[PDB]
């Protein structure tokens, strides 16, 4: 008996959430030993999965496959692989609440998907048991099958690594003693972003969360001080060793100009974004 279920998609936030804890709990009788969730996503979507740790009561023998869930998925539903290798520019976070013993896995699909992919994740509580009313009840397994559609449009921004040429418009392998400034102009509903080596220093801190305001003598300002109609995301160091940041404007009226820098003892790389509400990209 393999059951089936769906992951709720919030249309407003573009967020899919899969609710598995009550499905695999060992304290309640269930008729499916394994439940299958199927979800299809596209570029920039987010997938949120709350899942237990085995400190949580009725999940004492729980485990995840792939075991390194933060970094990996099951390719073709069987073999572990770094999600970066099949979905370059992916961002995952894996947060643990020390008090509730619940964790939250979050996967951001990057702003452009170069190839159609499928992969899965398994949350296996089949070894956990609870004695409830003199019945020994076992936990269950939830498997999430994820399909991601091809990504529509390359990012209009700056790959300073030379390794994401398939993802960004500007892409150049970094050479010593470089003073490169990548100029970008974007209108609404258009992705920008950048990739650097993670050992480069990114200024200001966690760009674009703070940026140099070009229209105010390059003062460091939080992006929220310049706009509140913008979505962004960031990973400081993915499993390949790269930093990426992504940014997109939605119904922003004010013309904005800002920058960020990735610098080392050898080179400087600057991304300068001009956002123009009336700009129409060619």
């Amino acid at each position, epitope marked *: 008996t393999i059951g089936k279920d769906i992951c709720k998609y919030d249309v407003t936030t573009k967020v899919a959430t899969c609710e598995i804890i009550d499905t695999i709990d060992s304290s309640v009788l269930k008729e499916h030993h394994t439940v299958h969730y199927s979800i299809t996503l596209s570029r920039w979507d987010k997938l949120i999965i709350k899942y237990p740790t*085995n*400190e949580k009561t009725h999940f004492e023998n729980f*485990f995840v496959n792939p*075991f390194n869930l*933060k970094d990996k998925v099951l390719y073709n539903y069987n073999k572990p692989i770094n999600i970066e290798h099949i979905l370059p520019g992916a961002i995952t976070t*894996d947060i*643990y609440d020390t008090r509730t013993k619940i964790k939250q896995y979050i996967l951001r699909i990057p702003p452009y998907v170069h190839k159609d992919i499928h992969f899965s994740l398994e949350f296996n509580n089949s070894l956990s048991l609870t004695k409830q009313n003199q019945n020994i009840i076992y936990g269950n397994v939830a498997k999430i099958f994820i399909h991601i559609n091809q990504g529509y449009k390359e990012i209009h921004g700056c790959d300073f690594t030379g390794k994401y040429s398939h993802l960004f418009t500007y892409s150049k392998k970094p050479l010593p003693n470089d003073d490169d400034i990548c100029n970008v102009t974007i209108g609404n509903n258009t992705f920008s972003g950048f990739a650097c080596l993670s050992h480069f220093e990114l200024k200001p801190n966690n760009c674009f969360s703070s940026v140099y305001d070009y229209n105010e003598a390059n003062k460091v300002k939080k992006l929220f001080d310049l706009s509140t109609k913008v979505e962004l995301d960031h990973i400081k160091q993915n499993t390949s060793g790269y930093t990426l940041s992504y940014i997109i404007f939605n119904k922003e009226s004010t013309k904005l100009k800002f920058s960020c820098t990735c610098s080392s003892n050898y080179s400087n790389y600057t991304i300068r974004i001009t956002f123009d509400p009336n700009y129409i990209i060619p």
Partner: nanobody
Amino acid sequence: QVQLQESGGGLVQAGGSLRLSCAASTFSSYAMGWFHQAPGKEREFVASISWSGGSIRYADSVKGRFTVSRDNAKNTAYLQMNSLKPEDTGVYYCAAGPYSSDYGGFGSWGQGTQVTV
């Protein structure tokens, strides 16, 4: 967190036996795990044991051959390695954390000990 140090690595033949220990210097509220890294591979899950010893999990490939245990009073965990096969060669790490159900639970790591079959 917790300071971990392993010991007990050795060379043996297909069928030989070995016994690693791992010493902590708060151990008794952590799950412990053993991990194996062969050359050119990642640290692969071998075994885990809850803080109480009540919950134990083994990689499917070492079932029946290895036995994890622990001694909370003495802050020591053990891996008993029997029926050693040549694939078992590699570096063995002990690790500790609040949980062991996914790799991110393990916040403290030892330094590894070599096991050659």
